[PDB]
Design a binder for this molecule. Structure first.
Ligand code: SF4
Length: 224
């Protein structure tokens, strides 16, 4: 499907059905988007929301998080699993307090230099909170693009992951990037699911190659 048609259909879909009232979209900031991206990495949204709210009440700024004892951070994380995320979260807050005056960095290289933050998390923080023109590629997004454009192969191989980053760059627009990147997370979470995707509710169904051939189970490829 042509890229300009892809982005316009995703944006029109988000206008009419999209998630717009999550706590981190009210009065968005880079701090709020970073905290939400780290909690969502290995946890589903319904579980994350109460934890996000308790972390913003206790730590209203990144300096408050940096100055707190690591044990108080681990105690509030209890129940989220995957505690390396919490240890990296605290070190990253200390780096922002120490190197950047307590203000969350706004350039890609400085954001991705934080522990716990990779290439997709960095572009999510800067596109969603400030409107910068960066694409994302988490597991939800990988599945939508690999099925729409029939990208087989395991994304654990570099050549395959690079093909997926190039497709995400191509379909991600500059006008409406904040809406588009949230919409691709929503589609991958709620519509183009791992098992039996809901293609009749998908705004890409008229041009998706997997839907034309009922071949969604081939994309992305699995570990060989
Ligand atoms: S039409 Fe179906 S397989 Fe294609 S992107 Fe949408 S939900 Fe996924």
């Amino acid at each position: 499907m042509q890229a300009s048609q892809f982005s316009a259909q995703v944006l029109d879909w988000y206008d009419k059905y999209g998630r717009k009232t999550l706590p981190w979209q009210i009065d968005k900031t880079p701090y709020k988007v970073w905290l939400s991206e780290v909690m969502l990495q290995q946890t589903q949204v319904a579980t994350v929301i109460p934890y996000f709210e308790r972390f913003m009440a206790r730590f209203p700024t990144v300096t408050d998080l940096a100055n707190a004892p690591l044990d108080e951070v681990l105690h509030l994380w209890t129940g989220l699993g995957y505690y390396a995320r919490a240890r990296n979260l605290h070190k990253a807050a200390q780096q922002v307090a120490t190197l950047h005056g307590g203000k969350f960095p706004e350039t890609f290289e400085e954001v991705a230099a934080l522990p716990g933050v990779g290439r997709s998390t960095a572009g999510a923080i800067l596109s969603l909170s400030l409107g910068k023109h960066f694409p994302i590629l988490d597991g939800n997004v990988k599945r939508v693009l690999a099925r729409c454009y029939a990208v087989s192969g395991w994304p654990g191989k570099k050549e395959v992951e690079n093909k997926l980053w190039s497709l995400s760059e191509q379909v991600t627009p500059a006008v409406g990037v904040e809406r588009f990147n949230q919409a691709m997370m929503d589609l991958g979470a709620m519509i183009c699911t791992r098992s039996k995707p809901k293609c009749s509710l998908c705004p890409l169904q008229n041009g998706c190659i997997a839907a034309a051939n009922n071949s969604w189970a081939l994309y992305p490829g699995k570990k060989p």
